């Protein structure tokens, strides 16, 4: 109630502000570039910003859903529970930077780093979801599905993290499709 | 009831942050340009920013009203409903960008491009409203009146969308007046 | 209760974001300038940014107090009340831009343009408070004291507004004193 | 209850926005610098940004919890208590600026000015918490511990603050350890 409802309320606000801050990274094309190539070729060349904004928005929504699900189940709060949640908020607000980094350097040669730090923050959040839930355990079917799912995540985002080093396109691809899949298995 | 109030709550917060973010697009006039021509002529030359901010703020407010209106009616959320809602939040958080583009390039020659994407995203938002509401449809006369309103919008924004190609001024105007019209018809 | 709690709530969130965005206008001193003159003289020359951030923050807080008092006392709501409230939100979210102008050009020659546009937006918000409440008529002692304060405000901000033309220092001064005064009269 | 609950609600929203605004100061490295030296050396050279962001995020979380503790214990609003809380919101919204100043100039020679303005805002918040809570004096067992801790902070941040003048490294360091420590003593 107050102990858990206050924490879940605060977390909901920080999630909302993180999600909406994503738009700011999308920068209107400069007057110079549009003057030489046309506003259209410019707004088009902005496609990885759209891509990064979109997949990152989507993934953060999934995080809001999972966060609410965990919070509905048990009402005891621990000191370390409060702080594991606090890190989770921290990585959520941090997501805009790897997003912006990724949109800025997706086409360019050192893109593999951009992709890796991106999948990094996502894997890192996944690990933190997993640890956050691990503290609670230590509806049977919901608990089981949740334990099973949060142990299923960090590995797959580790797969995205590792895939980054081989090629950018493959890593960003598995983050997009992985956002669709995790959205689907998240149970709204 | 409580779960729909939770999803509606998150959506209302994303609206508050989106609407307030709009102010950031209005850029204080540069020291150089103001230095040769004067603060007054500069703050005046900023008028398309005033215009885009005002119409975009007013319209997003109307979208908030309509969102709440849909949400009050029935308390049964599906995954697909939650996601129609989620995509709706994404286009709302995205609105500041077409806003900024429109303020920046209104006076300039490829303005029509900006204008269309402006009406474009709004048309897109209208469409998602419809789809979201269409999933609900599947006091009944009021529901019918709402279906008629949300079906009357997107065609008209295809018109505001299409008007963009003929001339910037006529399309953006039709977005101004059309925002006011939906403000009233939406009935607070 | 629910209707004014919902409208008042949404306006409450938009207020918090307007207030906090103020911090973004304070811009850390650039590397080129700080290298020639030293970090202290630069952070010092930023003083009108501190000044505008401070008074505007105070001002938006007092406006938050007034908002909550109006909403708490009577719960009946009209469409036209909702829209006076909407314009009131629009001017509130707009506050950061004139804050930024005022902070930027306080030292420089056309400061009087900035100061007048500043006192302007505050006067305008005052007028909109007045009109929002006027539509309410169209605790009785609180009603009387409130109407007397809302008569007293817009005239005094017209005094600050007109003072802007004679000298920047005097207009900004009456805005600072006026924020402390209205804070003392809102009676939180 | 309703006035303290509403006031606490507004204060918490300002906290959430302050904390998330923190990300914007981490600026994705410019195209030029990355093009001569490589993305990795650039993302690494950004580490004082990660440092200032991390310590400020953690510290602001702590201020959120301590704010919540003061508010839950006694619920009776005065004007002057409302204003002490108001100043406390202002400094919290001000936290991003000293954070960016600190991230930007940690490596540089006059870092000591940045560092001292950093610990300065933090100590200043400590003082404001101290007076905020002292407004209560002018269950019981907890009240004693809180007065001891709140009288206990501002001196220790005076220590971090004085430490800035001897060396940047010691000042920011003791702010780091001080953020972790106050997290634990706050009994989250």
Q: Could you please report the per-residue DSSP string of B33-92?
A: HHHHH-HHHHHHHTHHHHHHHHHHHHHHHHHHHHHHHHHHH-----HHHHHHHHHHHHHH
Positive/negative CA dihedral, B174, B178, B179, B180: positive
Boundaries of domain holding D170: 1-188
Å between A110 CA and nearest CA of chain D: 7
End-to-end C-alpha distance for chain C, whole angstroms = 20
Is residue D37 within 8 Å of D100, Cβ to Cβ?
no
Sole residue written with tokens 């600190």: D102
Taking alpha carbons only, the member of A180, A38, A48, A68 closest to residue A114 is: A48
Q: What is the DSSP letter of B25?
A: G
* Residue C49: both structure tokens together: 């940014």
Which residues in D have their CB inside 8 Å of a CB on A? 12-13, 15-17, 19-24, 26, 28, 31, 34, 38-40, 43, 53-54, 57-58, 61, 64-65, 68, 72, 183, 187-188
Sole residue written with tokens 């343009």: C113
Which residues in B have their CB inside 8 Å of a CB on A? 6, 9-10, 13-14, 17-18, 21, 24, 77-79, 82-83, 86, 89-90, 93-94, 96-97, 100-101, 104-105, 108, 110, 113-114, 117
Coil, strand or helix at D38: coil
B6 vs B91: CA distance, rounded Å: 20
Number of domains in chain C: 1
Taking alpha carbons only, the member of B57, B96, B40, B36 closest to residue C101 is: B40
Is residue C76 within 8 Å of C49, Cβ to Cβ?
no
C185 vs C182: CA distance, rounded Å: 5
B187 vs C180: CA distance, rounded Å: 39
Q: What is the DSSP letter of B107?
A: S
Q: Which residues contact C38 (CB under 8 A, 6 or more apart)?
A: D110
Q: What is the resolution of this structure in A?
A: 3.3
Helices A111-137 & A47-73, crossing angle to 10 degrees? 10
Taking alpha carbons only, the member of D91, D68, B14, B76 closest to residue A60 is: B14
**Cβ neighbours of B72 (radius 10 Å):** 11
Most C CBs within 10 A among D2, D10, D95, hence the mutation to make, goes to D10
Taking alpha carbons only, the member of C171, C127, C121, C175 closest to residue C151 is: C127
Query: Cα separations (Å) of D80 from B132, D1, D64, D92, D129?
Result: 48, 18, 20, 18, 14
Q: What is the DSSP letter of D30?
A: P
Give B-chain residues touching A68 at CB under 8 angstroms.
6
Is residue A64 within 8 Å of B10, Cβ to Cβ?
yes
Q: Is C125 exposed, middle or buried (0-12, 13-18, 19+ CB in 10 A)?
A: buried
Counting as contact any 3 or more CB pairs under 8 A, the partners of A are B, D
Q: What is the dihedral of CA A70, A71, A77, A79, to 10 degrees?
A: 70
Q: Determination method here?
A: X-ray
* Residue B145: both structure tokens together: 């009146």
Which residues in C have their CB inside 8 Å of a CB on D? 12-13, 15-17, 19-24, 26, 28, 31, 34, 38-40, 43, 53-54, 57-58, 61, 64, 68, 183-184, 187-188
* Residue B166: both structure tokens together: 């003929």
Give D-chain residues touching C53 at CB under 8 angstroms.
94
Question: Assign residue D187 a region: left if phi > 0, alpha if psi is -120 to 50, beta otherwise?
Answer: left
* Residue C57: both structure tokens together: 């923050």
Sole residue written with tokens 């706050």: D186
Sole residue written with tokens 């941090």: A94
The DSSP secondary structure of D47-61, one letter per residue, reads: HHHHHHHHHHHHHHH
């Amino acid at each position: 109630q107050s102990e858990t409802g206050r924490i879940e309320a605060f977390s909901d606000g920080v999630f909302a502000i993180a999600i909406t801050l994503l738009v700011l990274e999308i920068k209107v094309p400069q007057h110079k570039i549009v003057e030489t190539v046309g506003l259209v070729s410019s707004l088009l060349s902005l496609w990885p910003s759209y891509l990064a904004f979109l997949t990152s928005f989507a993934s953060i929504l999934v995080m809001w859903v999972n966060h609410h699900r965990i919070f509905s189940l048990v009402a005891r709060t621990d000191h370390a529970f409060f702080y594991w949640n606090g890190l989770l908020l921290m990585l959520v607000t941090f997501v805009p930077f790897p997003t912006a980094l990724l949109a800025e350097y997706l086409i360019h040669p050192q893109a593999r780093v951009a992709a890796s730090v991106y999948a990094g923050i996502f894997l890192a959040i996944a690990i933190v979801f997993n640890r956050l839930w691990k503290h609670a355990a230590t509806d049977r079917h919901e608990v089981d599905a949740i334990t099973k799912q949060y142990r299923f995540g960090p590995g797959l985002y580790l797969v995205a993290f590792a895939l980054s080093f081989i090629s950018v396109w493959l890593s960003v691809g598995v983050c997009f499709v992985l956002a669709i899949y995790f959205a689907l298995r998240s149970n709204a």
